[PDB]
Design a protein around this ligand. Structure first.
Ligand code: CA
Ligand code: MG
Ligand code: MG
Ligand code: MG
Ligand code: MG
Ligand code: MG
Ligand code: MG
Ligand code: MG
Ligand code: MG
Ligand code: MG
Ligand code: MG
Ligand code: MG
Ligand code: MG
Ligand code: MG
Ligand code: MG
Ligand code: MG
Ligand code: MG
Ligand code: MG
Ligand code: MG
Ligand code: MG
Ligand code: MG
Ligand code: MG
Ligand code: MG
Ligand code: MG
Ligand code: MG
Ligand code: MG
Ligand code: MG
Ligand code: MG
Ligand code: MG
Ligand code: MG
Ligand code: MG
Ligand code: MG
Ligand code: MG
Ligand code: MG
Ligand code: MG
Ligand code: MG
Ligand code: MG
Ligand code: MG
Ligand code: MG
Ligand code: MG
Ligand code: MG
Ligand code: MG
Ligand code: MG
Ligand code: MG
Ligand code: MG
Ligand code: MG
Ligand code: MG
Ligand code: MG
Ligand code: MG
Ligand code: MG
Ligand code: MG
Ligand code: MG
Ligand code: MG
Ligand code: MG
Ligand code: MG
Ligand code: MG
Ligand code: MG
Ligand code: MG
Ligand code: MG
Ligand code: MG
Ligand code: MG
Ligand code: MG
Ligand code: MG
Ligand code: MG
Ligand code: MG
Ligand code: MG
Ligand code: MG
Ligand code: MG
Ligand code: MG
Ligand code: MG
Ligand code: MG
Ligand code: MG
Ligand code: MG
Ligand code: MG
Ligand code: MG
Ligand code: MG
Ligand code: MG
Ligand code: MG
Ligand code: MG
Ligand code: MG
Ligand code: MG
Ligand code: MG
Ligand code: MG
Ligand code: MG
Ligand code: MG
Ligand code: NA
Lengths: 272, 92, 46
RNA sequence: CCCCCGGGGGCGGAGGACCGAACCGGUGCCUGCUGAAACAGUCUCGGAUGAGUUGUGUUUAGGAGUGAAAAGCU
RNA sequence: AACGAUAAAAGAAGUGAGAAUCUUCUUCGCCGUAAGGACAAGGGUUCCUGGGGAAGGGUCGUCCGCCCAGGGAAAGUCGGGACCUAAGGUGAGGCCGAACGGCGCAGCCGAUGGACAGCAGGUCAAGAUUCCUGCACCGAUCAUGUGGAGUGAUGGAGGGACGCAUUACGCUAUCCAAUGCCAAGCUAUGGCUAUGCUGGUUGGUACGCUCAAGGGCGAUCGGGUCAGAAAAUCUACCGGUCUGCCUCAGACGUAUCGGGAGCCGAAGUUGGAAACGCGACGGUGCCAAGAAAAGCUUCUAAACGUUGAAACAUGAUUGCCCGUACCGCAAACCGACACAGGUGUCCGAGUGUCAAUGCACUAAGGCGCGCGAGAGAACCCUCGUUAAGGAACUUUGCAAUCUCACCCCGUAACUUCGGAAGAAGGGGUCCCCACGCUGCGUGGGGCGCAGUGAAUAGGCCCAGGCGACUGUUUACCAAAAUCACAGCACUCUGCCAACACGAACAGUGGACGUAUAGGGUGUGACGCCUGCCCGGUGCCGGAA
């Protein structure tokens, strides 16, 4: 389900919003709040860098464990599954026996009260911290290290999955969300199952400035600018002639990767 | 020490009616504080002090000779004694 | 008709002050350059 | 959400919803044009719970900043 | 030419060399969600008193925010500091860099926020939670006594700690009525002899077997080491375990200190209204998911003791530094001016009118805007009415009418089934009496040309172009069909990501984000859809 509305305002007919009924309606845990809103409004040394970052609504950061390795061998009980305006991919509070509390990303299909287990020998049940070497072939997982320890770059957002392929001397093959295939060391941890909030995509923002609530400012087109301001500068009417970015280059098809190491670790073919 | 902390008594019709209340009013060096101003009053005149108040006061900006002038800068302090309300009697 | 000069004692002294001219070379140039003019204004601190 | 069989009633109180003061703004006419004013006045008009308005404090600058974009503001 | 808003002014009296302009008296007119009052920025003696009259004042001037002199400004409790942290600024060590310099953890600075002990009155010419009177509270040191032992950290935990809309109950501020009370006198004009008129009609504190909505809270014994660095009798997890307690908002009474119209001190009633304030951190719904730190509460680590403890009771002593006058929507701040501009917050009464900070008139309060007097020509500006006609005017119905508020009846094509819609149109609107209901309604009667009787308060409809829509722009000739916009598409990007700032193997932004994400480009809600041409150029592959 996702909410839809009657057309009582000219907006608000197309508009859509997520269903929150599964989210426990609680204040986030006080120890994990970190705060650190402090939005860096695209600015660097006062100077814009990621252009078009506006203000939006205020936010706190929810520290989220990613490595999950340190509490190997302890059981966890899933308390609340809960909202988070940073990940936009619902998180899940959990309590360990011995009483430490830390958030974890919520897998698709995980309910409140479920068991959660971490460590090397743990069984491939939903939401466990398993190193790749013990993952059964063809299982889907998310939340994935690139190097053992301090990893969780791969598969983190709504509905993303990592489909393990064959295995080698200590490297496993996996299918990333982008359709790339990649090697990864077998002691990297992963989390069983795809990501929760599996259908973030079909929310319909509806009106301008529903984006502003998300803090993304209006995104100017070149062709409305001036020759001074952008290469797609003026001239009486409307057109093209070259097709280039802000500062120049291509941006329809101009492969932008550098010629480097770890391209040998991305050794299976990559659409991207 | 204490003698040259005290500046000169206020001479004001308001200050002199307060003279009749056991209240005494006089200027002091502005950078002095209340604690030392009180022990100065009572080292000098021999009397218990039970109430101090103090106030920085800007110098008026007079002008002579069509050279624009400056301030002067003072700090009048008002003090109430115990029932032993004497000073030098020098009130008038 | 809001106008260009809206006085502010903390603004006036935080930029422009004696403390702020010493924070950099270029301002210490502003001091010794005006001291040489023999001015008296020197900064905004009077 | 509650009744009668998507309809009607109960209730509830949503909204870049409506009229409208403050407030923000500048639509049309007139006046003003050695002005009351180096951009305003009266009348009229737009927005008026939002992409809203505003105060403090602070960051970004000269081929540079900033710009819901006029080569506009600095 | 002008003498700075069309909110008027008149008379008497006074002072003086001198008066339309200064003072007084009595009227008149103007504001009254202000043009009254209280603050913050900012200004700097402009404040009060006594003098003055050059210049400043758009005239005058005996006056002034001008000139001269003298005074005025009081804090343990209000605001800031000796307390805390945000962005930001710094920053030993550390990372970089032709030099000067650029980054940067802890820490430090930094209020626009957090924490924190007083209320009522009196009153200088000029100060008031500051001085005075009454009566409190807060910390610290000491003493007497009870107690006669555990205190319990630069470290741990809890807690401080926070959104938006709406809304139930109770209440005060505060406002209204009256043949409630109290005080004072009079009355004529035609009448009333008071049942008329006018005015006032309670603040703080202490004590209640007094009435009281609302609001807060579960609570211990034990298990586990793998959690909070170790500790821990405090927290967190897990398992056993059984409506009631606390709080007073506010009201009432008794007492007491004040205040109180008034000629020293009267009354202090009953009925009604009512906050955004208080009870409070209440309830409900929602998505865009709503600071940190100290103080505060709880634990041991170390150390100090365990016959001069923590803590409590009374008494004493102690209470630093800075701000405080006046202006403060303006004659004192910003505008070169005593300028029709601009300037953040709080309070802002009454009558009428569905409501109201709207509109009119008015309270308290404050003003009549620092040239005046006449005349009633042309012309010019802001207004009133206009015969017959009614857009014939003109680029254009531009301007100016018309319409106007609330109640009732009635409303089209077309539609994204919400809307179009206040469609259009037509009717009601006052006063008296009787009747029903909770100010309405039903009836009967009355007056006027007219009853939202004055003020505020839509003209409407048909048909096109463009853009879907709210919104944004050229400060000072363009507000639009421009910009953006939700939605769509191409492409890039595997994470020290692409990309962007950068002297830099520095550091940052992207982002404490990770392909359902981020950048770039172009289109621009929604519906039906998006054809032919890879030769040229660009781009991705091939690479004899
Ligand atoms: Ca006629
Ligand atoms: Mg629905
Ligand atoms: Mg730029
Ligand atoms: Mg876009
Ligand atoms: Mg352009
Ligand atoms: Mg160019
Ligand atoms: Mg072009
Ligand atoms: Mg151009
Ligand atoms: Mg063209
Ligand atoms: Mg660029
Ligand atoms: Mg005192
Ligand atoms: Mg100074
Ligand atoms: Mg000097
Ligand atoms: Mg109802
Ligand atoms: Mg609206
Ligand atoms: Mg409409
Ligand atoms: Mg305006
Ligand atoms: Mg504008
Ligand atoms: Mg309109
Ligand atoms: Mg509108
Ligand atoms: Mg350039
Ligand atoms: Mg004029
Ligand atoms: Mg007169
Ligand atoms: Mg005479
Ligand atoms: Mg004369
Ligand atoms: Mg006059
Ligand atoms: Mg006068
Ligand atoms: Mg007289
Ligand atoms: Mg005022
Ligand atoms: Mg000041
Ligand atoms: Mg002052
Ligand atoms: Mg005066
Ligand atoms: Mg006087
Ligand atoms: Mg005088
Ligand atoms: Mg004169
Ligand atoms: Mg002279
Ligand atoms: Mg003159
Ligand atoms: Mg003081
Ligand atoms: Mg006192
Ligand atoms: Mg304080
Ligand atoms: Mg600090
Ligand atoms: Mg810092
Ligand atoms: Mg630095
Ligand atoms: Mg503050
Ligand atoms: Mg306090
Ligand atoms: Mg007096
Ligand atoms: Mg005064
Ligand atoms: Mg007082
Ligand atoms: Mg209520
Ligand atoms: Mg009566
Ligand atoms: Mg009466
Ligand atoms: Mg203990
Ligand atoms: Mg009583
Ligand atoms: Mg600290
Ligand atoms: Mg004052
Ligand atoms: Mg003015
Ligand atoms: Mg304003
Ligand atoms: Mg009111
Ligand atoms: Mg009123
Ligand atoms: Mg009313
Ligand atoms: Mg009004
Ligand atoms: Mg005034
Ligand atoms: Mg005439
Ligand atoms: Mg006119
Ligand atoms: Mg007629
Ligand atoms: Mg006609
Ligand atoms: Mg003609
Ligand atoms: Mg014609
Ligand atoms: Mg035209
Ligand atoms: Mg017109
Ligand atoms: Mg039909
Ligand atoms: Mg219909
Ligand atoms: Mg229409
Ligand atoms: Mg008639
Ligand atoms: Mg009639
Ligand atoms: Mg009328
Ligand atoms: Mg045509
Ligand atoms: Mg438009
Ligand atoms: Mg313009
Ligand atoms: Mg501008
Ligand atoms: Mg215009
Ligand atoms: Mg590096
Ligand atoms: Mg970084
Ligand atoms: Mg376009
Ligand atoms: Mg095509
Ligand atoms: Na009579």
């Amino acid at each position: 389900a996702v909410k839809k509305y009657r057309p009582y305002t000219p907006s608000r007919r197309q508009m859509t919003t997520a269903d929150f009924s599964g989210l426990t309606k609680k204040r986030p845990e006080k120890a994990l709040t970190e705060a650190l809103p402090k939005t860096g409004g695209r600015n660097n040394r006062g100077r814009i860098t990621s252009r078009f970052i506006g203000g939006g609504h205020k936010r706190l950061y929810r520290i989220i464990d990613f490595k999950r390795r340190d509490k190997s061998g302890v059981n966890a009980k899933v308390a609340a599954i809960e909202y988070d305006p940073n990940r936009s991919a619902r998180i899940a509070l959990l309590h360990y026996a011995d009483g430490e509390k830390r958030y974890i990303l919520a897998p698709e299909g995980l309910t409140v009260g479920a068991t959660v287990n971490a460590g090397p020998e743990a069984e491939p049940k939903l939401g466990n911290a398993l190193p790749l070497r013990f993952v059964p072939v063809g299982a889907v997982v998310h939340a994935l290290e690139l190097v053992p320890g301090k990893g969780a770059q791969l598969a983190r957002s709504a509905g993303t999955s990592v489909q393990v392929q064959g295995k080698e001397s200590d490297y496993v093959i996996v299918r990333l969300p982008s359709g790339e295939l990649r090697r990864v060391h077998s002691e990297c941890y992963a989390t069983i199952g795809a990501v929760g909030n599996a259908e973030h995509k079909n929310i319909v923002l509806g009106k301008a400035g529903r984006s502003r609530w998300l803090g993304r400012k209006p995104h100017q087109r070149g062709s409305a600018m001036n020759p001074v301001d952008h290469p797609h500068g003026g001239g009486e009417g409307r057109t093209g002639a070259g097709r280039v970015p802000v500062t120049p280059w291509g941006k329809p098809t101009k492969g932008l990767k550098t010629r480097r190491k770890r391209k040998t670790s991305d050794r299976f073919i990559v659409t991207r | 020490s204490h003698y040259d902390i005290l500046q000169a008594p206020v001479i004001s019709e308001k200050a002199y009616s307060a003279m009749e209340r056991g209240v005494y009013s006089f200027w002091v060096s502005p950078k002095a504080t209340k604690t030392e101003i009180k022990d100065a009053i009572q080292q000098a005149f021999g009397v218990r002090v039970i109430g101090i108040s103090t106030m920085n006061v800007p110098g008026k900006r007079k002008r002579v000779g069509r050279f624009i002038g400056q301030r002067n800068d003072r700090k009048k302090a008002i003090v109430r004694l115990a029932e032993g309300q004497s000073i030098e009697a020098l009130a008038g | 008709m809001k106008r260009t000069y809206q006085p502010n004692n903390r603004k006036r002294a935080k930029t422009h002050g004696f403390r702020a001219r010493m924070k950099t070379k270029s301002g210490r140039n502003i001091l010794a350059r005006r001291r040489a003019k023999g001015r008296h204004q020197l900064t905004v601190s009077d």
